Amino acid sequence: TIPEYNDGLLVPLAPPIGPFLPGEVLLRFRTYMRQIDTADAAAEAIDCALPQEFVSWFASNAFTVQSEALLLRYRNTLTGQLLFECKLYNEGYIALSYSGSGPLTFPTDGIFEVVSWVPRLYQLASVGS
């Protein structure tokens, strides 16, 4: 959650991630930190909208926008099995159309390949778990 930037006051900061179309969830990245613990052994995870080397490659090349979102394609580079296609909005978060109920994980050995610019009202194929 947001910490205290002022000691007790308010401060301008980045707006929340959104909005999404009905039926789209936020694609999260995941690393595990060092938490001092007493008895819990579950690894505390911290999620970003985009990892590093995606905050470089932007502002090192400053692209245009030309629409509203990018149609990515996370094709697993081994044998070319298409895992999922996801929308990257211009505010810098990846939205993947999922209709399930629990956490579906993904293999971390594929290359994001761009396809095209889409409008905001684009509908993706769902994922299966």
Binding site: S56, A59, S60, N61
Partner: protein
């Protein structure tokens, strides 16, 4: 404007016949492909078109060596992502406009295709069609770069055996200057396509190719991180009082990605 230089060093005769360019490959390509007629108007600088002759160079040092292709123009190296194929010749200038106190000569030969590369000693670079010129020439030395081939065109994938253009340093560079300076003549190499250059077949423009010279990220070194320790960079500096040829293992990449 002194005329103690050599202004009588015009584009000399070379023992070569005229070579047909796109007239051969017209009925073996599948479409009509012309390029912009303002590409042929001005001499723009080659991407590998900058060299320099210090007086610490022996005779027989190869100054530049560039194959004929679309890589001799910033326009044609940009247009050759859209095409698969080219034909025809180029026209190359040479800006060797050194001081009025230097002395020395270069020789620019025309090496044919399928000539074995590697050594190319100075004794045998005169056996090709060559142009000899002083390093004090005022006007730009022009020379043609013909397209000798046995196939009807070349693909735009750089393994094509094509006519090179080698420039050996013939006699060493020296100055009769009255004190303490030895000038380094800095040449350039300008080029434009000839009257019958032509690309062949249109294709999706892919960036990840050949030619498509190297680009760098626009970020200050005070923002970048360090490749031997997890920390930022805190100012670059030279020092000739250190280990001069170290043998590090971290942060050592090639410029072909490996």
């Amino acid at each position: 404007s002194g005329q103690d230089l050599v202004p009588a060093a015009v584009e000399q005769a070379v023992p070569i016949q005229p070579v047909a360019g796109a007239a051969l490959a017209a009925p073996a390509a599948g479409q009509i492909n012309q390029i912009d007629p303002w590409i042929f108007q001005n001499f723009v600088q080659c991407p590998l078109g900058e060299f320099s002759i210090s007086p610490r160079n022996t005779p027989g040092e190869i100054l530049f060596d560039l194959a004929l292709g679309p890589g001799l123009n910033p326009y044609l190296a940009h247009l050759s992502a859209m095409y698969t194929g080219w034909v025809g010749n180029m026209e190359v200038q040479l800006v060797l406009a050194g001081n009025a106190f230097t002395a020395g000569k270069v020789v620019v030969a025309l090496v044919p295709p399928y000539f074995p590369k590697g050594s190319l000693t100075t004794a045998q670079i005169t056996c090709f069609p060559h142009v000899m010129c002083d390093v004090r020439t005022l006007e730009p030395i022009q020379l043609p770069l013909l397209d000798v081939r046995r196939v009807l065109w070349h693909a735009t994938q750089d393994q094509e055996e094509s006519m090179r253009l080698v420039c050996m340093l013939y006699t060493p560079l020296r100055t009769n200057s009255p004190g303490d300076e030895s000038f380094v003549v800095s040449g350039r190499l300008l080029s434009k396509p000839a009257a019958d250059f032509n690309f062949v077949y249109l294709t999706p423009p892919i960036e990840r190719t050949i030619y498509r010279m190297v680009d760098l990220p626009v970020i200050q070194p005070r923002l970048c991180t360090h490749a031997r320790w997890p920390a930022p960079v805190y100012g670059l500096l030279v020092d000739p009082s250190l280990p001069s040829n170290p043998q590090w293992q971290n942060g050592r990449v090639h410029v072909d990605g490996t």
